[PDB]
């Protein structure tokens, strides 16, 4: 049978300021219903840049891209080939959607363009980082707004005309517990100020 592949995700450095882009939400079984989760893509990280760029070069040149006997199972990983020598790593996050785990973009599931992820390309974690907003107890009435809040947060850096920064405060399973901020504008502080959540 086909091997069911699930890439781990990139860790953020503890108590270290990093530059991040808020990307499309990658769901994880490791997020509690009342944890405000979000997906970050650390940017301007030269250490990993050459590694990811090298991976994509080899993936595009890879000869032995094999198809699934059956198909990519939901929740698991393979590759998406949108054209010859254009190959990227994906997770089938739902029946109709793939997630480009190294770019932070959701695209439509195309059965014919999906192939297995070769073992040699399973060593790099997803470039995106699974994250959760640290230090908060959310009002139950607010939890339904998490999607809307994520959309706002995705555009926050653009509206600030600034690169957002993050700092991992800890780790809960596979989730980076982070603060997200732009200068003195701290996400948890502005949410807490609206009374939809309280500090732990």
């Amino acid at each position: 049978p086909d091997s069911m592949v699930l890439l781990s995700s990139s860790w953020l450095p503890l108590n270290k300021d990093i530059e991040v882009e808020v990307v499309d939400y990658l769901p994880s079984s490791s997020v509690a219903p009342d944890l405000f989760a979000l997906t970050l893509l650390r940017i301007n990280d030269s250490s990993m840049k050459e590694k990811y760029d090298s991976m994509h070069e080899k993936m595009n040149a890879y000869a032995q891209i094999v198809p699934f006997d059956s198909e990519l199972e939901i929740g698991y990983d393979g590759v998406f080939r949108d054209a010859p020598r254009s190959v990227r790593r994906v997770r089938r996050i739902s029946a109709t959607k793939l997630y480009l785990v190294d770019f932070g973009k959701i695209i439509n599931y195309e059965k014919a363009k999906c192939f297995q992820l070769p073992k040699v390309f399973q060593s790099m974690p997803t470039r995106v980082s699974l994250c959760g907003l640290d230090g908060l107890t959310w009002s139950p009435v607010a939890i339904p707004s998490f999607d809307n809040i994520r959309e706002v947060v995705k555009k926050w850096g653009q509206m600030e005309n600034s690169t957002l920064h993050a700092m991992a405060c800890g780790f809960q399973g596979s989730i980076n517990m982070i603060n997200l901020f732009c200068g003195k504008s701290i996400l948890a502080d502005r949410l807490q100020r609206k009374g939809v959540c309280e500090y732990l």
Binding site: A142, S145, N148, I149, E151, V152, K155, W156, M159, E160, C182, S185, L187, R190, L191, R193, K194, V196
Partner: peptide, 12 residues
């Protein structure tokens, strides 16, 4: 009222 305030206000 910050910029992010306004953003969050519409989401809520």
């Amino acid at each position: 009222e910050s910029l992010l305030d306004a953003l969050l206000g519409k989401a809520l």
